From Swiss-Prot:
UniProt keyword annotations, A-Z: Cytoplasm, Nucleus, Ribosome biogenesis
GO BP terms in the entry: endonucleolytic cleavage of tricistronic rRNA transcript (SSU-rRNA, 5.8S rRNA, LSU-rRNA); endonucleolytic cleavage to generate mature 3'-end of SSU-rRNA from (SSU-rRNA, 5.8S rRNA, LSU-rRNA); maturation of SSU-rRNA from tricistronic rRNA transcript (SSU-rRNA, 5.8S rRNA, LSU-rRNA)
SMART domains in UniProt: AARP2CN (SM00785), DUF663 (SM01362)
Designated name of the protein: Ribosome biogenesis protein TSR1
Family membership noted in the UniProt record: Belongs to the TRAFAC class translation factor GTPase superfamily. Bms1-like GTPase family. TSR1 subfamily.
Pfam families, sorted: AARP2CN (PF08142), RIBIOP_C (PF04950), Tsr1_G-like (PF22298)
Protein purpose: Required for 40S ribosomal subunit synthesis. Required for normal export of the pre-40S particles from the nucleus to the cytoplasm. Its subcellular location and association with pre-40S subunitshifts from mixed cytoplasm/nucleus to all nuclear in RPS19 disruptions, suggesting it acts after the ribosomal protein.
PROSITE patterns named among the record's database cross-references: G_BMS1 (PS51714)
Principal location: cytoplasm
InterPro entries to which the protein is assigned, alphabetical: AARP2CN, Bms1/Tsr1, BMS1_TSR1_C, G_Bms1/Tsr1_dom
Intracellular or extracellular location(s): Cytoplasm; Nucleus, Nucleolus
The organism of origin for this protein: Saccharomyces cerevisiae (strain ATCC 204508 / S288c)
RNA sequence: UAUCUGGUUGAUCCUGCCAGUAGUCAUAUGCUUGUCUCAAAGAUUAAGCCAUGCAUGUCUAAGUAUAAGCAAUUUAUACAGUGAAACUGCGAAUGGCUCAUUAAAUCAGUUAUCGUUUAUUUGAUAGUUCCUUUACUACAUGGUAUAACUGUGGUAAUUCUAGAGC
RNA sequence: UAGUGGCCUACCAUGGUUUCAACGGGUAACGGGGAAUAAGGGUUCGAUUCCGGAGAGGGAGCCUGAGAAACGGCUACCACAUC
RNA sequence: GGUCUUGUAAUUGGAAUGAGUACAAUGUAAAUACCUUAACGAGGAACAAUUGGAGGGCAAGUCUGGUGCCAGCAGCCGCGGUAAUUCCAGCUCCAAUAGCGUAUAUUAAAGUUGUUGCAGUUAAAAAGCUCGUAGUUGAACUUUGGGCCCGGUUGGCCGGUCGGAUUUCCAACGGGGCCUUUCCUUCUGGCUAACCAGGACUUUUACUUUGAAAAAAUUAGAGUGUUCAAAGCAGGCGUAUUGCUCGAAUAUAUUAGCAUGGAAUAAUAGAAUAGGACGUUUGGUUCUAUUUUGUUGGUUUCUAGGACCAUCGUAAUGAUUAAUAGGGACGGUCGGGGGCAUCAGUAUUCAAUUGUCAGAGGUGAAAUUCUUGGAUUUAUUGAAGACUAACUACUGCGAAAGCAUUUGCCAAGGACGUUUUCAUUAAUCAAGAACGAAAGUUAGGGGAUCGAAGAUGAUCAGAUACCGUCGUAGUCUUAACCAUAAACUAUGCCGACUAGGGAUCGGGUGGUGUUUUUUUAAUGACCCACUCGGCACCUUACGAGAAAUCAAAGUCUUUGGGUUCUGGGGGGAGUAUGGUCGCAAGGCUGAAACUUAAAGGAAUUGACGGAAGGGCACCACCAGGAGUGGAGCCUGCGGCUUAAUUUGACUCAACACGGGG
RNA sequence: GCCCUUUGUACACACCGCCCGUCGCUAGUACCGAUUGAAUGGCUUAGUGAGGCCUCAGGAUCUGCUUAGAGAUCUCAGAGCGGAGAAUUUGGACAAACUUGGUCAUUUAGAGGAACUAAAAGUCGUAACAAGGUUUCCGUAGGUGAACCUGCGGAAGGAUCAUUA
């Protein structure tokens, strides 16, 4: 009735809205504050091979003076549940050795608090230290609270000595600047400021890290529950986004498996409504029957340019014999018409990095020697008009389709199923994270080489989803790694991480421009600056991580050869390709209307039958071939202006190659 | 130091808005950052919530010493120089912070108290006190009550305190 | 009451304020010198080192005392919240 | 010939230094630093100043590459479609400089808040017109001119001081003592009015002038070498011989409050009864004790100090005006002014009689109706309404809406004349109240006229749907509303003046003034003059306005005669919402959310026409000739076919084939 | 047909229905909210009202003076009276607060409606089909696919050369 929203001195009654803000500051104090399933992973990895965190646990905590001193033990615990008697919390500090580079980047999904070890003794190395900066950094640092752990650096000068601290406080801020000062080991309350940082200072969050169900791997077992399965008694402080009884369990480096009964020490089984233990979709073989494009390659008259162009020129072959002797180009048809390895990194490094321009400028040029044939090589695919305007498709019916392309979970869209896939975990989230859990995880006897008991070593365990058991086809966004100048050809197996886990996938990089129509290329090779878009089949981990593509070798002081970082863009079937061609025209003279071009067509059936190709200049002057006669190849057309011997009278082969699957590398 | 400029029309003669510009003991903030003297600095936005430590206690010739406490006894058997604790007195109503309230309220300038209280400070001020000073008197000075001292204890824990003897 | 007084209280009178704006409402309102100004006037701000007022999270209430409706004083309620 | 320089000069040339490290001690409660201080650390690679721009506002290239709508660039406009000054870069340059940007907020320019100091004819804005209260203002009058001197200040011929007035001649700026009715008072001890007590003022508020209160800190400024400063109120000087000694101003802060003149302005009015002042007067009323009485209290007077009746002696005994401001009376006019009856008109259509004997009706073509039981052009009598047609305008009036023929009736008004009466009774206007076109709203009268809607005929495509015919209500009135107009002269109402005019109409006057005839200028009307009322016009525009135009849309930047209501860019929007007034329809008051670089005013210059004139052309037309138009081929191409069956623009095209048979 | 051109006089580009509109979908947000949860309160209706302070009282107790029970400054019942005086209870007024009614609400959580918004995409009508109005108003009354039209009043914000004694 009355629009009477005035008299708002009881706008102060709407400090009720601050009460919601009070409610905003209550339910987030549920999972992180206590002892019963509230102890946090803090992994201390210095940037320096010295500083050796047995004194960082001890000589730093000589100001705390509770008995984390007493268990600061040569029997390296790594589950340090010392209840420190002033801020009331059990703890966990992972102290890894400096070399085991395989889980430091992998255990960091539960690991909230990350602490660099900063030293002016060793210069932070451009392959060890600065690249551990780039490795811990570009996975997404959950919380970076820097500590100068230097005991032997407080007397390297006596004459305003504080440059040993300023050079490190700025070095925390040259890449990851969210600390102001970095603390000396000579003030008192800075050691229980660590426990303030654990208890009262809540950590901040990574986008991709906190989207799933992720668990802790304290201990495992060797059980016999099948001819080839067992069980796992895992102590795990779960911090996931909300588990479900429908979910599956994930042993990284080995496989994808299933439980027996989810319990607490309330029984939740591995119930019937599940995807049975496939990897490619089992309905995919039957999905190799949606004959969307039966584009038979040699049983046509016209390419798919119907959709305003050609009336088709029919060549109805009705040959008649040529009886008398001696024949030129002309007289045959009017004879008797009864009309009724480091060396090849210098040998083949000449070409296998400089053939990267064979992709760019002459992609599918039919190249022309008098021995090379024009018909056979680039034969068996369409030739539409323009990549920003044409029409290429998803699922033809050919043998060119690989194994987990025609046996796919054909991913609909990524963006229109990320709401499904994530909201399968948003809504169907039943088993409560935050607690402790004793689960009978069925554990196969096959994969019992490298599953260990980490009180001193490094391993972790992850979770799965319902339809993450199925797999799909991905299309990455990649940038070149910084200060990594040398290119790599892009039809080659690169070990893809999108996140942390490793797969030697065989991608297809294409240009990462702003694409209106979402139509791509089969670009063979790379570009040294801009964004690349990979295209491959991967067995899919659907949470948009900063992707790391590398070479599987312990080459540098890093145990990786970092090739390039980028973005897990999507997993999409209709994100489709079209490889270009640019043919050649070299104008032999300087004409007015009809330009006599040579160096264009050698053979007569390569002259005559290849007169159905659209003539376009490199300047873009499109058009069609009306005639041609050249042998050592002319034409006769009509363009905007005139032509010159440095022009390119190009022609169109717009062809479509087909993608390549992955390889799971773990070693 | 009483400056204005660009935008409607094809244009001689021609109105009202917008944008630019300059200050800010206005804030915030980007980039850069070497000296000298300075120097604000948790108001808004939460008159919202707090670990921890500190911020108010105090004694001189001149209120109460048997510390068993000590220094030298050296000037003394009544005491006498120092002096813990404790009684007593004064202080703790000043300072410091914050600005939510509050619109004839506060406050500001001017009034008034012939209508009122005032530790302190400063100045002045009790022959009549046995109310019979015709006395049951001790004014050569009359009584209790107690802390600390002590020595037996309980409390999960508080600057909790109990029982007796001084 | 320290004291004037509708400050109450007991009987009386029917008054008092106002379009010279009563009363009611809002204030991102603590009031006074300051600031940005700069032909002059006008404009907007003033939590803030000084003066005065108010409060010790919000309302009550009382002791000691010359002085407090005191909170690094006390009792109770209300909102919190420690071992 | 280079004494001197502008830079090219990277060839120089040694000397020279701080930020930074340091003994040293000061420095400080203890330390840092900072004035101090020896040792050590510079050459351009040194020990290197960044930040924003580079199309206009807005300095600074149309330099060169990649870029040619592809991004770009844009606070507002403006470019790039390929000659980009405006794109990515390379240069290079421009500013401010350990400092430059950016975001919002305010101030300024911003006469876009206007008291100073806007704007309403058309650009947003004057309302429908009167009556009216609060408020805001409000007509004119009250002691001039001159003498006696005092000389505070200046002119300088004086110069006697040689930057200055002291003997001082000529005039000039000031207030006082006093005076030409200029009362400037009375009241007397100090007293013989200089000034101090004493009784009244030639009235009280509004106004203003000088004090006082206005905390210190801020704002303005001596002085001070804190090294200048920002600061700070500090400090300076010798024989340092044992000390000497300057300071730490003032300016400011209205109302309100408290003291005194000033003598206008506005206010308030005396003395219209003269029951009043000058009453220095007299019986009588309230009186009376500082008293003297005799020391102190019941009983008294004369008596110091006020008032009036009986009562009259006193000087000059009280009526500021009749307004080119209003209100009355009375007078002749005036009168399509308004109102109440009567009343006439050309006739109108409707109704009848009567006369009649086969078409009219519209529109651009057409389509809708009456009648041999009588059409329509004839002849005669009524109901209703309308308006008084022409005379009807350089009109006359009325608050506005409005009103045009007579006669009687009813007041007022307007004008004009007056040597009549009120003597400021006054202007507008919050609130409040009358009236109110057309239309519309309830209850009635007629029901003649046409006629929003509607019922019919239309009638062909949208030459365009303008046509035509009947029509409830309505138009006309009665008892009442409504409260709307381009209700507009697009201009609120009372003031001031100016132009310049020939007429008007309402009044007033009569020329040795001209004619019918009261008898040269009578009834009436005139030429020449003159006055105030209403309606108008056009000039040069002095003044404006931006401009059309305006004698007021003036006397406004040379800004203020009084008062009332509106407007702040366009929209959104007179929309929502709420408060009202009505039975209603609607009327009165009135936003935001959002979006914009515009909306708007008057004014002008000449392309294109679906405007065509004349020419004048037989490279076009009529009279026909030659003759195509049906065909074989030279001569010349577009089409098939090619290793080859080549090729293109000028009078510019359907052509020359480019001497190419 | 074009020259001398005249002249409507820019159309200074004279105004309007009039052309990316329907069905079935993609998402984004206006809004209301027929509905219960709040969330705490303005206002006030009602029954309770902690608490200290003052009073009507009460009197654990310890005491003392004096007459006191017993020995030359003696307690073994005291007895009046006096002093201080810790519980409980009367009343008072001050009174934070509970138990409540409607109401105004807000920020809100479901709950359901009509919608609009984008280059929005298959769609046949006005994409993909062609013309027509070409006095402008104001008040007011009516019809309206539309500027327009009609009724009564009004206006110019509209284009007057000539004959006159």
């Amino acid at each position: 009735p009355d629009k009477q929203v005035s008299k708002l001195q009881r706008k102060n009654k709407a400090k009720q809205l601050r009460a919601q803000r009070i409610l905003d500051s209550i339910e987030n104090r549920k999972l992180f504050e206590g002892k019963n399933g509230a102890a946090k992973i803090i992994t201390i990895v210095p940037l320096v091979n010295d500083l050796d965190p047995l004194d960082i646990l001890y000589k730093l905590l000589k100001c705390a003076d509770d008995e984390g001193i007493m268990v600061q033990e040569v029997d390296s615990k790594r589950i340090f549940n010392v209840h420190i008697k002033k801020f009331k919390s059990n703890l966990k500090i992972i102290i890894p050795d400096m070399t085991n580079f395989l889980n430091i980047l992998d255990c960091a999904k539960v690991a909230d608090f990350v602490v660099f070890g900063l030293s002016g003794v060793q210069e932070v190395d451009e392959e060890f230290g600065e690249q551990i900066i780039r490795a811990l950094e570009l996975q997404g640092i959950a919380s970076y609270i820097g500590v100068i752990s230097n005991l032997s650096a407080v007397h390297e000068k006596e004459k305003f000595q504080l440059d040993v601290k300023q050079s490190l406080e700025s070095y925390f801020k040259h890449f990851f600047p969210s600390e102001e000062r970095v603390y000396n080991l000579e003030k008192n309350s800075d050691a229980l400021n660590v426990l303030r940082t654990l208890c009262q200072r809540l950590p901040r969050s990574i986008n991709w890290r906190d989207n799933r169900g992720y668990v802790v791997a304290d201990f495992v077992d060797f059980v016999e529950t099948s001819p080839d399965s067992g069980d796992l008694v895992i102590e795990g402080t779960v911090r996931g986004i909300g588990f479900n009884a429908n979910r599956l369990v994930h042993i990284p480096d080995f496989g994808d498996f299933q439980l027996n009964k989810i319990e607490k020490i309330t029984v939740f089984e591995s119930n019937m409504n599940r995807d049975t233990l496939d990897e490619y979709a089992p309905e995919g073989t039957e999905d190799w029957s949606d004959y969307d494009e039966d584009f038979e390659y040699d049983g046509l008259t016209t390419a798919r340019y119907d959709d305003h162009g050609f009336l088709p020129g029919r060549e109805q072959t009705s040959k008649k014999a040529a009886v008398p002797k001696g024949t030129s180009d002309y007289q045959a048809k009017w004879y008797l018409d009864d009309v009724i390895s480091p060396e090849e990194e210098e040998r083949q490094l000449r070409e296998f990095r400089d053939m990267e321009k064979e992709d760019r400028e002459f992609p599918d040029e039919i190249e022309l020697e008098p021995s090379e044939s024009a018909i056979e090589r680039l034969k068996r695919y369409r030739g539409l008009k323009n990549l920003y305007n044409c029409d290429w498709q998803v699922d033809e019916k050919d043998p060119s389709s690989p194994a987990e392309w025609k046996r796919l979970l054909r991913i609909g869209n990524y963006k229109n199923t990320k709401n499904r896939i994530i909201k399968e975990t948003k809504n169907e989230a039943q088993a409560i994270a935050g607690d402790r859990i004793r689960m009978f995880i069925r554990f196969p006897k096959f994969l019992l080489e490298k599953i260990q008991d980490p009180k001193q070593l490094l391993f972790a365990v992850y979770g799965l989803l319902l339809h993450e058991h199925k797999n799909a086809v991905v299309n990455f966004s990649l940038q070149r790694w910084e200060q990594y100048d040398k290119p790599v050809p892009s039809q080659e197996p690169i070990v893809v991480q999108y996140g942390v886990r490793r797969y030697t996938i065989q991608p297809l990089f294409s240009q990462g421009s702003n694409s209106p129509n979402n139509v791509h290329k089969y670009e063979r090779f790379l570009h040294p600056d801009t964004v690349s878009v990979a295209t491959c089949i991967a067995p899919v981990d659907f949470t948009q991580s900063p992707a790391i593509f590398f070479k599987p070798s312990p080459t540098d002081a890093k145990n990786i050869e970092l090739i390039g970082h980028g973005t897990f863009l999507n997993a999409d079937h209709s994100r489709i390709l079209a490889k270009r061609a640019i043919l050649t025209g070299h104008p032999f003279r300087f004409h007015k209307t009809v330009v006599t071009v040579r160096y264009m067509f050698f053979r007569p059936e390569d002259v005559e039958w290849f007169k159905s190709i659209p003539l376009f200049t490199k300047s873009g002057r499109s058009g069609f071939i009306k005639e041609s006669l050249g042998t050592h190849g002319y034409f006769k057309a009509t363009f905007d202006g005139k032509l010159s011997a440095q022009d390119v009278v190009a022609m169109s082969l717009y062809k479509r190659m087909w993608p390549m699957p992955s390889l799971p590398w773990n070693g």
